[PDB]
Amino acid sequence: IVGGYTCGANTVPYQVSLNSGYHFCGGSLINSQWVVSAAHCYKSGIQVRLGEDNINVVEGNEQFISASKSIVHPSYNSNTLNNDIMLIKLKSAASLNSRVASISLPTSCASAGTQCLISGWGNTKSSGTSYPDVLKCLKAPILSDSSCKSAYPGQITSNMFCAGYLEGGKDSCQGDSGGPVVCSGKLQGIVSWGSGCAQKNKPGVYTKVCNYVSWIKQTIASN
Numbered sequence: 001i002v003g004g005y006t007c008g009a010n011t012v013p014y015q016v017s018l019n020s021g022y023h024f025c026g027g028s029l030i031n032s033q034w035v036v037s038a039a040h041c042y043k044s045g046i047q048v049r050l051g052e053d054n055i056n057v058v059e060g061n062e063q064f065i066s067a068s069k070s071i072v073h074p075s076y077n078s079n080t081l082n083n084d085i086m087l088i089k090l091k092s093a094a095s096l097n098s099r100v101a102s103i104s105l106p107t108s109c110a111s112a113g114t115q116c117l118i119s120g121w122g123n124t125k126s127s128g129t130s131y132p133d134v135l136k137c138l139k140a141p142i143l144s145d146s147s148c149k150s151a152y153p154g155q156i157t158s159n160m161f162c163a164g165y166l167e168g169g170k171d172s173c174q175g176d177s178g179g180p181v182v183c184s185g186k187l188q189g190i191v192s193w194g195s196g197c198a199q200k201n202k203p204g205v206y207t208k209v210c211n212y213v214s215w216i217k218q219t220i221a222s223n
């Protein structure tokens with residue numbers, strides 16, 4: 001997260017870190033056994049880390065649970081990043097509490113102008129490279145479809161939205177991939193892609209989760 005703030009330990013209780021020897025992506029806990037992330041975060045040997053603040057230090061609220069299976073969206077295209085969504089099932093159910101909690105799925109799509117919270121352990125620099133150990137947060141509005149398409153000609157599908165600031169300075173970045181965009185207590189987005197970070201007229205692009213609720217529910221119900 002570039003131009004954000006330190007969230008505070010366990011203040012974003014649905015935020016997970018995906019770890020394969022190291023943090024490589026964010027995710028969102030949506031029930032005791034399931035995490036939603038980006039399809040471009042797919043790899044084998046995933047351990048889900050819940051209750052994290054400092055990802056380099058065991059602080060006492062963590063639960064580390066190995067993934068039993070991952071399900072990339074059937075229509076995910078890695079070239080265009082269309083349908084950039086994946087489900088991860090935990091080998092055992094997380095113990096839910098005030099610091100490890102699920103986030104609700106949307107019942108309807110959020111509009112341009114809706115204020116959201118984007119979070120992650122990604123790069124905090126727009127030119128250089130610096131990775132924080134503690135969770136970073138950014139409050140950001142959803143941008144209009146028209147401004148999103150104008151920012152990225154030929155690249156924005158009906159399964160994507162832009163959020164952030166056309167002036168630059170505040171954005172998600174490398175390592176935030178797969179993490180949450182939460183608006184009014186609903187998971188509306190997944191950190192998906194952009195052109196660099198926090199650059200003028202290049203806001204972050206997010207997977208439009210409301211399009212996937214039926215798939216998520218049906219997949220969970222049979223797996």
Ligand SMILES: NCCc1c[nH]cn1
Binds near residue numbers: 174194205
């Ligand atoms: N807005 C950029 C988010 C991102 C994803 N991967 C790398 N960067």
Ligand SMILES: [Ca+2]
Binds near residue numbers: 052054055056057058
């Ligand atoms: Ca920790």
